[PDB]
């Protein structure tokens, strides 16, 4: 896998891939990665499939709870420390997360956390995890303002994604888009790097490595 | 560490009417990390093509040391090696390396010049020749290759078609391996015209 | 030893290498030059286990000047980079090989074209437009895909370095002190000092 | 040291239509490079127009696939005999699986049938409960030969529209029935011819509307 | 691997299938496992594919070259001798498992060698992974003064377990037969019980499917 | 374990030893609360039969849960301690695991589960 | 393997089962483990197979070579060679042999050399993995200077429990009686042994 | 966790046109050692199952002690015991089936590969193995160790599948049985010439043969085998 | 260890050496491996000592109630109880352990119970180290329904053998007479059973 | 985690504490505030194992915030510092201990006096004038030993602490990406900005 999140003036930006393999093995090109909570929650998906897929699929069921009991959506805070809590419990276990919760809530703003399986809990505002993280953060870093326009924001979580798609051998299939507001999250489609490498190439000018 | 899953890649070869065809992807990686996408894995000494899969440092220098083999077998025997003479001498080289093999699987391809017969066929690191009437599979996807080759082949193909089947079980075995991909290249053999197409692949 | 790049531009080839030299829990120099000259237009920069990597390359540097003596000629950066892959070739299967991965740019004066060679410790010789040995290349190669063009000047070419450098002082986990510089085009090899 | 595990060998394969869904397998059932069975059936109705296959680990196997049974029989008593439907079942074996996360199921398991707008659906899960919906998925020992060649013929990957410069993709289609079997048939005597493992026969078990019905078909023997 | 000899009469007889494996994958469908290492002296072989054929040249070429230096037909005996002794020389290094059989001048012989270099001598032999099916066979049906045409179909049957019950074993039945004062008689494929059943459909691709970047001609002349 | 089902419904359907548990409440000294726009004020009695205090020492009337919420009572001393310390703990608890102090409402619910929890256990009051 | 040598009156007889083995599965039940090195010197081998084979083969070249110079060389004599191979090899080896001959001046003559490469000149010699179960009986029954008859009756009586007992040994009792006389093979089936 | 001690080698068996056959000889193993000759491990259950065990004999006969009491559990209450609600070889192989998975899941283990062989009440064969990993599997014929790789491929030569069942005789899958028997007996280290056979047919019944001897054997070829090679005398 | 115990006309003997080991040094000479359970069930014991005496006195406890309860118990009982705890406690345990008891109804009867927990019945039973070496011996010389003197014979004459061959055994060899006449201890010492 | 450091000066203590958090080859962070207030006049830092050193910092936080509310009184540095070595004495010998380092910066009320406090991860106390945990102590106590007098202000202790951060930014191999300065003294805590 590949992954990221990063905020913005105009919000928060996710985007990750869809390989699954086992080994060398690619089982699926078209695995979510990520898991939508509430309308105002995203959780992403890196490492052990069945771990972050179940775990994270029981946050929500957990998420839900809080908002029966309290009259209230919970918190990105609360709600990253409950799978974070959840981990360090299994903490020697053997379970393999890499995970960011993104979401909007009044008196937070736009928060970002990440958190994996060893129990490492970190607010922040730009994060790649995963196989590929190293060649996400790459072009991420590279290109970052935090003045980006929500249009070019979304093309370079795209492009990080593609980028990482590209160079690491464990990432790959399609590129899967969010954007979170003020007013919930937003997908923005999933995008075969099939295509989408192709079309890069020829209109943006890069991929020179590449036989055209 | 396993010597022969470091660097990634294919190979596959197949038998048409009258002609044959070899196939490789492009891909060079350091394990994750992909490195270059211009590593082309098949070689040709006169009219005898050989692939070859594996630890790429040895694909160079078996190439350079058959690239040697050939010119003064050509010198001394004034004449081209064919394919079956070149099939028993990669076997007789690698066999020569037995308890410190090259991490290789090579694929040998061509048409006999006298008689006009189409020949292939594979190696295991060591030399045991495995020779076919239809194709040879070599590399990281090659279980790939085998299901695709086994189910997508019939014999007595068109090199137009035989181009399309070759390079249609190139591709798909190589999107369902990690370390395959990134580029392909398929070689056309007819008795006297070669034709060398690049294939347009997914890049990831 | 750790980080070395290589960028090849329009007209040349720009090697950038780290300055650090640790052992243990100490950097006990910031200053070392991780390269050698083989030849006026060759040179090698390298990285790897301690020792070996020095040792190595002085070893090519005397085999390549020792030819350029005997023959008055300077080899072209293809032939040099197969002689090198070749020793490392052999080196693999030795009773203890040398554990070094090199960077070769040269500016081939036949050709009046730029060559970047990345070769690893196993022999492993590969042509490109960028390249990067260890853990520099998991940042680098998506950096460079993305703003490298073929047809860049030195100055481009330079800029582009300056980016690389700046993401892996940002994202790689241990000091590297810098790099130093250098340029390999037509005219020979020279140092950039404000870098 | 005694190992809980053992491989039973096998392939299985799951494809779904527009209006129906199949599950195949073959029957043949092995230890190291001895044939226990040539006729052992691992494909089975479970109920509900689902078929489930557990493949690898045979008790394991047997073991999921007795307890999803008995999962759907529960889910009548407790839910006024409401259906069970595909997409239920999916996360139900989930549960299953990861519920032994730590002692896995060492088996790779797929149910098809048809969900609740009555098209084909397959779903198929990794040992430890790893699950997602697809048109096509092959499991067990020959997957690595089958699956790429159901990703060219199924999915159409890699294929282009003639003359249009590989710009143009060939377009996704249902396939029927009959088109299906074809590719389930030549899949497995592929797979049969290729690993040592595949044999003996194949068992097909398709889902429609109308319900569950079975085709067998000999596979070679050596 | 399951390969068999058996005496007769007047000589005697050796069979193979032909099965090479590389894991669980069938590398080739239809190698050969009968070797000539003289005229009337040949080698079935098991284990290491490459060195059951690389032993058996090697030791085939030293017995031409001693034959033509002794001015001598070639012994079983010799071939026994020198196997042996290079395959004890390499301490089971060299992974080949022989049934070594022919004619000569002192009669006719059938032998065995380990990959480490012990040896045996029998009626009836066999040799690797399906030599206990093969063995079952020979147990069962073989007896005292068997005739050419007796021994050829006790040895061919002997495979043919191997073939079905082995999952090291498959396809074809190679024979050779080794009379005493005639030639030997090398049957390639003397049973092909395997034969693949016909495809359900052509996978013949419209032309053009296949999207290209690049074309050229290449240059193989000097 | 000590089993026994004290607080038990009664013919005509009242739960006496809850209802024996509010005349404790009225026994207790008067506590009250006043709201304003902008404070709450919590006032308490301290009965004058006890001369001789140390006002230091003692107990007051007024407890802090956490340094936002405070918790007065009327009825048993000793009974309210245990309130007292479970809902401070329930305090931190929150804190640690929401990372946000609790509401007033959160707080009072908390202890009202408690109160309730202690009229259908077997072998309290 | 279950192997004896036992001298008597007229000479030495050799015994041996003829089992060999890779695990539990038989891979010869009519191995032949009685062996001639010399016209009336032989061996009874145990261990490997491979490296019994080897050896004889060796020691067989050696006292040929020894006859063609020297004449018929001696029981002991090919015993020394025997050991020589065993001893400089131990590390390589898992031999354990039994040499046996007939001398006209010394008759019957047993040493027996072990995994190790040391001798023994004994009266009789037992050795192989069954040997383990026939050590009570054979000490209780052998006697010197037997018959022909008692010293055979004695072999196929003690190697019949070392089968009966020892998985590893089985099939027919191979025999081979050396004297002034010559050389006699005689062999005895489960049918008669069995039952004894 | 186990290592097994005192074991007993193949189970052999197969189905026949009116029923089941099932032979195993009477040897406990310690190791290389042939150290019991009298032990019985063929387990008739009622006068319609039969159950064959190999491996650990300790396991052996505490799983024979279950089936004991499971006839005497099955007895309470039942005035169709000896009827209708007598115990089916389908019922007993589930029990054993669950029970061996079960201490598989444990990580304590029987060590055993069993074989139970029987008639149903309708007349049905019934013929599945099971074993320490609880892997269960059926066929027409089945057999544990050795059996499996030299038993088999000679009972598969009369029943290939299921439709040669109905031609296959009690006679001759007998016969095909005890050759098995043999040649087990030629090639197996572990193997005794002693063996029981039990015989459960639809219309005759439960036959158990205790006391059968491996007979007409070939050794008389071994005379002329001499040396390993070159030697002649 | 060397043990045995050996039914016949009258009922059953057991017989023991009466040593005991930790590596090569013998830490008891006079051991005595013969030990009650009940007035006419005995056991022999090979193994861990430790481990044997354990198991020897728990025995020794059930029979104990149980003859409180129930009377005599039957020898069969009492092989029972053994196998119970050998088996359920296989994992921890180095016991090998032959039962043997007189009954008036069943007269001599032995069962062993060897490392596994499995229970056997039988004529007579050998067990222990020294065990292997007298197999053979004991096959061919035991017959059903031996007199008493016979029958401490047979045991004296295997145990020296058993002792003669084996370094783990030595001493004295005990025997114990179980007949309905009552019980008899015996003792043998070296200078007697060495020469035999 | 990694670099956590103490000095004790005349009216203060002084903590610093390094800012990356590294996970692989990737700086994930480098703003990371490695410390928690335990009382108003008690400041913690922490390092070692990941998920274990917030865990454990948390939980102590926790329990020393339900004591100061249970008896409306702060606890004095030294009784929290025992507290604190007691419950990673009891971990120890855990099924899964805390592997957490940490430093405990003080100003005692009733003494008018700064402490400081170095536990580790066994449970092992030590006051100290100048502390630090993992590698950083050695290069910093040699350097304190020389430089450190027991009667400095405050501003001079910071001057101090610069000169180890600058020692440990030339000689360790790692990028720890500088540190968060925190003054506990009379007047409570209070977190410099610049530095
Ligand atoms: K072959
Ligand atoms: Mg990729
Ligand atoms: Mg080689
Ligand atoms: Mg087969
Ligand atoms: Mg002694
Ligand atoms: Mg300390």
């Not at chain 5, 090398?186 to 053009?208: A, D, I, W």
């Not at chain 8, 009690?170 to 087990?184: F, G, S, T």
Request: glycine content about 8%; overall charge negative; charged content about 25%.
């Amino acid at each position: 896998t590949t992954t990221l999140a990063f905020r913005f003036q105009g919000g928060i930006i996710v985007a990750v891939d869809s390989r699954a393999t086992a080994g060398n093995w690619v089982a699926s090109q078209t695995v979510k990665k990520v898991i939508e909570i509430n309308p105002f929650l995203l959780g992403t998906m890196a490492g052990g499939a069945a771990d972050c897929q179940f775990w994270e699929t029981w946050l929500g069921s957990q998420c839900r709870l809080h908002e029966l009991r309290e009259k209230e959506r919970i918190s990105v805070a609360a709600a990253s420390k409950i799978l974070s809590n959840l981990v360090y419990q299994y903490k020697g276990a053997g379970l393999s997360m890499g995970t960011m919760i993104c979401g909007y809530t009044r008196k937070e703003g736009p928060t970002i956390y990440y958190v994996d399986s060893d129990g490492t809990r970190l607010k922040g505002d730009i994060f790649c995890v995963g196989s590929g993280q190293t060649f996400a953060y790459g072009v991420l870093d590279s290109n970052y303002k935090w003045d980006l326009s929500v249009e070019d924001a979304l093309y370079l979580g795209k492009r990080s994604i593609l980028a990482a798609a590209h160079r690491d051998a464990y990432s790959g299939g399609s590129v899967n888009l969010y954007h979170v507001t003020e007013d919930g999250w937003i997908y923005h489609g999933n995008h075969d790097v099939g295509e989408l490498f192709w079309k890069v190439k020829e209109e943006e000018g890069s991929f020179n490595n590449v036989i055209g | 560490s396993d010597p022969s899953s470091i660097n990634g890649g294919i190979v596959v070869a197949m038998t048409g009417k009258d002609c044959v065809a070899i196939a490789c992807d492009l891909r060079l990686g350091s394990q994750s990390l992909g490195v270059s996408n211009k590593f082309e894995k098949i070689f040709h000494y006169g009219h005898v093509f050989l692939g070859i899969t594996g630890l790429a440092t040895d694909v160079t220098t078996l190439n350079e040391m058959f690239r040697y083999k050939t010119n003064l077998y050509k010198l001394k025997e004034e004449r081209a090696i064919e394919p079956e003479t070149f099939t028993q001498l990669v076997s007789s080289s690698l066999y020569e390396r037995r308890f410190g093999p090259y991490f290789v699987g090579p694929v040998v391809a061509g048409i006999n010049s006298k008689s006009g017969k189409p020949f292939i066929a594979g190696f295991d690191l060591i030399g045991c020749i495995d020779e076919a009437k239809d194709f040879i599979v070599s590399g990281t996807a090659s279980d790939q290759l085998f299901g695709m080759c086994e189910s997508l082949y019939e014999p007595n193909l068109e090199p137009e078609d035989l181009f399309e089947t070759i390079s249609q079980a190139l591709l798909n075995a190589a999107d369902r391996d990690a370390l395959s991909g990134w580029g392909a290249v398929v070689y056309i053999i007819k008795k006297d015209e070669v034709v060398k197409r690049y294939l347009k692949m997914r890049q990831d | 030893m750790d980080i070395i790049l290589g960028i090849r531009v329009q007209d040349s080839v720009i090697l950038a290498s780290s300055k650090a030299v640790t052992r243990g829990i100490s950097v006990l120099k910031d200053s070392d030059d991780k390269t050698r000259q083989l030849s006026p237009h060759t040179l090698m920069s390298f990285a790897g286990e301690a020792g070996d990597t020095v040792q190595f390359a002085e070893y090519i540097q005397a085999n390549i000047q020792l030819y350029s003596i005997r023959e008055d000629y300077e080899l072209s950066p293809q032939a040099v980079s197969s002689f090198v892959r070749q020793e490392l070739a052999k080196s693999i299967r030795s009773r203890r090989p040398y554990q070094v991965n090199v960077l070769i740019g040269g500016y081939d004066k036949k050709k009046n074209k730029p060559e970047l060679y990345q070769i690893d410790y196993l022999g492993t010789k590969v042509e490109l437009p960028y390249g990067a040995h260890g853990y520099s290349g998991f940042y680098t190669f998506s950096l460079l895909d993305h703003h490298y063009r073929p047809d860049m000047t030195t100055e481009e070419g330079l800029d582009l370095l300056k980016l690389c450098v700046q993401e892996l002082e940002k994202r790689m986990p241990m000091d590297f002190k810098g790099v130093i510089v250098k340029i390999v085009d037509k005219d020979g090899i020279r140092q950039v000092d404000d870098f | 040291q005694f190992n809980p595990y053992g491989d039973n060998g096998g392939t299985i394969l799951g494809i779904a239509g527009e209006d129906f869904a199949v599950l195949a397998g073959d029957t043949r059932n092995i230890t190291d490079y001895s044939i226990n069975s040539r006729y052992e059936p691992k494909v089975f109705d479970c109920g509900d127009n689902i078929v489930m296959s557990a493949n690898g680990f045979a008790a394991d196997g047997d073991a999921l696939v007795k307890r999803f049974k008995n999962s759907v029989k529960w889910y009548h008593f407790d839910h006024n005999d409401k259906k069970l439907s595909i997409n239920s079942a999916a996360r139900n074996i989930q549960h299953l699986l990861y519920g032994k996360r730590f002692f896995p199921y060492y088996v790779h398991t797929i149910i098809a049938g048809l969900d609740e707008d009555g098209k084909g659906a397959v779903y198929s899960f990794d040992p430890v409960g790893s699950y997602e919906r697809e048109q096509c998925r092959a499991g067990g020992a020959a997957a690595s030969l089958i699956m790429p060649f159901l990703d060219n013929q199924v999915n159409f990957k890699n294929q282009y529209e003639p003359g249009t410069n590989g710009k143009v993709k060939k377009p996704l289609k249902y396939l029927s029935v009959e088109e299906v079997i074809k590719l389930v048939r030549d899949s497995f005597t592929s797979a049969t011819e290729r690993h040592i493992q595949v044999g003996d026969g194949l068992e097909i078990l398709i889902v429609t509307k109308d319900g569950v019905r079975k085709e067998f078909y000999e596979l070679k023997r050596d | 691997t399951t390969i068999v000899g058996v005496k007769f009469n007047n000589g005697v007889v050796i069979a193979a299938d032909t099965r090479s494996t590389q894991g669980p994958i069938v590398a080739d469908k239809n190698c050969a496992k009968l070797h000539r290492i003289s005229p009337k002296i040949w080698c079935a072989g098991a284990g290491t594919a490459a060195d059951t054929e690389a032993v058996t040249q090697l030791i085939g070429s030293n017995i031409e070259l001693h034959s033509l230096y002794t001015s001598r037909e070639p012994r079983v005996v010799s071939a026994l001798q020198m196997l042996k002794q290079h395959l004890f020389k390499y301490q089971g290094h060299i992974g080949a498992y022989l049934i070594v059989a022919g004619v000569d001048p002192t009669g006719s012989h059938l032998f065995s060698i380990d990959a480490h270099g012990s040896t045996d001598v029998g009626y009836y032999l066999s040799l690797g992974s399906g030599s206990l099916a093969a063995m079952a066979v020979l147990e069962s049906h073989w007896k005292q003064d068997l005739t050419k045409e007796e021994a050829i179909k006790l040895a061919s049957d002997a495979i043919q377990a191997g073939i079905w019950n082995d999952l090291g074993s498959g396809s074809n039945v190679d024979v050779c037969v080794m009379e005493i004062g005639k030639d030997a008689e090398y049957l390639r494929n003397y049973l092909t019980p395997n034969v693949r059943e016909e495809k359900q459909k052509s996978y013949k691709f419209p032309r053009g499917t296949t999207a290209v970047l690049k074309e050229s001609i290449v240059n193989i002349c000097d | 374990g000590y089993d026994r089902a004290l607080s038990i419904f009664s013919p005509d359907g009242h739960i006496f030893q809850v209802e024996y548990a509010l005349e404790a409440v009225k026994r207790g000294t008067c506590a009250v609360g006043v709201k304003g726009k902008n404070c709450v004020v919590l006032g308490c009695e301290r009965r004058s039969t006890l001369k001789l205090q140390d006002t230091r020492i003692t107990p007051s009337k007024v407890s802090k849960i956490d340094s936002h919420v405070v918790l007065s009572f009327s009825g048993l001393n000793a009974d309210s301690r245990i309130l007292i310390e479970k809902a401070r703990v329930e305090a931190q608890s929150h804190r640690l695991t929401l990372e946000d102090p609790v509401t007033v409402e959160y707080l009072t619910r908390y202890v009202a589960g408690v109160q309730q929890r202690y009229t259908q256990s077997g072998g309290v009051r | 393997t279950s192997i004896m040598a036992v001298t008597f009156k007229d000479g030495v007889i050799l015994g041996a089962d003829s089992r060999t083995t890779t695990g539990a599965y038989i891979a010869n039940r009519v191995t032949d483990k009685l062996t001639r090195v010399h016209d009336k010197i032989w061996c009874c081998r145990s261990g490997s197979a491979a490296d019994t084979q080897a050896i004889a083969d060796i020691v067989q070249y050696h006292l040929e070579l020894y006859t063609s110079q020297y004449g018929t060389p001696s029981t002991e004599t090919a015993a020394s060679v025997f050991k020589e191979l065993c001893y400089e090899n131990k590390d390589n080896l898992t031999a354990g042999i039994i040499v046996a001959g007939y001398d006209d001046k010394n008759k019957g003559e047993v040493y027996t050399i072990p995994l190790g490469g040391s001798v023994h000149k004994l009266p009789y010699a037992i050795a192989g993995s069954g040997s383990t179960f026939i050590y009570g009986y054979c000490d209780k029954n052998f006697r010197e200077n037997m018959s022909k008859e008692e010293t055979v009756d004695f072999i196929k009586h003690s190697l019949s429990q070392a089968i009966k007992w020892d998985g590893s040994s089985g099939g027919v009792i191979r025999m081979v009686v050396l004297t002034a006389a010559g050389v006699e093979r005689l062999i005895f089936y489960p049918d008669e042994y069995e039952q004894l | 966790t186990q290592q097994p001690i005192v074991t007993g080698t193949s189970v052999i068996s197969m189905k026949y046109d009116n029923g089941v056959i099932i032979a195993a000889d009477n040897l406990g193993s310690y190791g290389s050692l042939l150290r019991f000759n009298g032990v019985e491990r063929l387990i008739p259950v009622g006068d319609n199952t039969v159950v064959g065990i190999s491996g650990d004999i300790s396991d052996m006969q505490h799983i024979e002690r279950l089936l004991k009491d499971l006839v005497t559990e099955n007895a309470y209450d039942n005035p169709l015991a000896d009827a209708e609600e007598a115990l089916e070889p389908s019922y007993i192989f589930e029990y054993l089936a669950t029970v061996m998975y079960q201490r598989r899941s444990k990580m304590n283990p029987l060590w055993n590969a069993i074989i139970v062989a029987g008639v149903q009440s309708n007349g049905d064969q019934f013929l599945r193995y099971v074993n320490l990993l609880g892997v269960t599997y059926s066929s027409p014929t089945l057999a544990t160790g050795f059996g499996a790789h030299m038993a088999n491929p000679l009972l598969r030569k009369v029943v290939d599948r299921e439709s040669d069942i109905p031609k296959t005789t009690v006679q001759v899958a007998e016969e095909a049985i005890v050759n098995a028997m043999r040649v087990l007996y030629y090639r197996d280290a572990r193997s005794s010439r002693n063996f029981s056979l039990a015989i459960i047919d639809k219309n005759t019944g439960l036959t158990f043969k205790k006391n059968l001897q491996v007979e007409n054997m070939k050794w008389d070829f071994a005379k002329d085998i001499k040396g390993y090679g070159t030697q002649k005398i």
